[PDB]
């Protein structure tokens, strides 16, 4: 095995070009090795990006072959990556790796996270999720608030200014392809209360200095 050490700044804005490098200890840039980049979007699988040999032949994945250039500095046993016209969709953990003889990746770098700041500070839209009894236990209903398209984390959600805590489930946010977050908060309450008890979700997004108190009324 060999030791692979990748560096590179991870934090980079979009539409641009990404650039990283990797260093190799205990090996040589000779023979049949293919020096490889593989990436992993958050929550997703491994995606082969491209390879380069010691002479400088390359193979790139057709999906981006037009936009990706690999290079090697044979003198210091380094290879490097350059990807053009990027997005938040290139956000991913990027690994360098060595492909050995019959097509297996014996040595991997630690990975470098390419978080792409495509978005800027943005406060959420808040929509009411009107009560439904279809999925809850007898005599109860679930209602909530959809907290849509904010950045960065975090948002906080209380109910009835914190008087209502029992039965609240605020779900971890999704990080969308747009680079913005959305989350939902739901509370299960007595069905008999719906005509007399007011339900308000208190949404606070400190990064944008935004507060929303959204009344969640039954719908008819």
């Amino acid at each position: 095995e060999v030791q692979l050490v990748e560096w590179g700044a991870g934090l980079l804005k979009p539409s641009e070009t990404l650039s990283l490098t990797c260093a190799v200890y205990g090996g040589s840039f000779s023979g049949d090795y293919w020096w490889t980049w593989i990436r992993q979007p958050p929550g997703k699988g491994l995606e082969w990006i491209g390879e380069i040999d010691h002479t400088g032949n390359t193979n790139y994945n057709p999906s981006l072959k037009s936009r990706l250039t690999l290079s090697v500095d044979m003198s210091k046993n380094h290879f490097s990556l350059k990807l053009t016209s990027v997005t938040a969709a290139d956000t991913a953990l990027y690994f360098c790796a060595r492909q050995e003889g019959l097509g297996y990746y014996d040595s991997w770098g630690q990975g470098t996270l390419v978080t792409v700041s495509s978005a800027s500070t943005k406060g959420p839209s808040v929509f009411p999720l009107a009560p439904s009894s279809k999925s809850t236990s007898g005599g109860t209903a679930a209602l909530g608030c959809l907290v849509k398209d904010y950045f960065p984390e975090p948002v906080t959600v209380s109910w009835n200014s914190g008087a209502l805590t029992s039965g609240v489930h605020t779900f971890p946010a999704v990080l969308q392809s747009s680079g913005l977050y959305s989350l939902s908060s739901v509370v299960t309450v007595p069905s008999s209360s719906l005509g007399t008890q007011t339900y308000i979700c208190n949404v606070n997004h400190k990064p944008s200095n935004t507060k929303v108190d959204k009344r969640v009324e039954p719908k008819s």
Partner: protein, 209 residues
């Protein structure tokens, strides 16, 4: 375009044998390798050249490539084997499978609760439409979510979280479907279908509600 298929999730009881499989046309003509990946860590090669084990990989890991299926067999599965497992096939070109999450069961299985909300009238007035599919109290922490427009799988618009551990050691996840108001109002219904451990729960909402 060449394709290796693996199931997204497998669970095994401690000490039992786990089989993780990967299929592809004429996979037997290609050399299969397997990688173990634990969270925020580099994949680790556990099998190469169909059935060879690197020095330092435990003997309970074995591999085979026959019948056009590559199989990673872990005998006497231990807690420490919980991880995502990727197959890879090489013929000169490299293809990875989609990964299998192996859960080594530490508690009994728990089936998900699914709540589906339609777009709110308020959001439709803002010329947008989001369906919200909330999934909770499930174990193993692995689900597949499929959305349907009437009965047809959607082509676009889905954002789904990875499962996260709840305070009670079960898991939660959420999935969102983004539509235009015209798409929402022009179908009879949309459905969120959640598959967990080979069982499926499908909830459905309709614009007339």
């Amino acid at each position: 375009s060449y394709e290796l298929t693996q199931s997204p999730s497998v669970s095994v009881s401690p000490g039992q044998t786990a089989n993780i499989t990967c299929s592809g046309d004429k996979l037997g003509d290609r050399y299969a390798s397997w990688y173990q990946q634990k969270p925020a860590q580099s994949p680790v090669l556990v099998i190469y050249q169909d059935d060879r084990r690197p020095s330092g990989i435990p003997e309970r890991f074995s591999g085979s490539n026959s019948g056009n299926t590559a199989t990673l067999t872990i005998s006497g599965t231990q807690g420490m084997d919980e991880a995502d497992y990727y197959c890879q096939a090489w013929d000169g070109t490299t293809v990875f499978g989609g990964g299998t999450k192996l859960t080594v069961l530490g508690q009994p299985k728990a089936a998900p609760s699914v709540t589906l909300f339609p777009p709110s009238s308020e959001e439709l007035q803002a010329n947008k439409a989001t369906l919200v599919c909330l999934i909770s109290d499930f174990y193993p922490g692995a689900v597949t979510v499929a959305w349907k427009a009437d009965s047809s799988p959607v082509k676009a618009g889905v954002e789904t979280t990875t499962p996260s551990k709840q305070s009670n050691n079960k898991y939660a996840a959420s999935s969102y479907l983004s539509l235009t108001p015209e798409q929402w109002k022009s179908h009879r219904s949309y459905s969120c279908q959640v598959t967990h451990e080979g069982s499926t729960v499908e909830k459905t909402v309709a614009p007339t509600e």
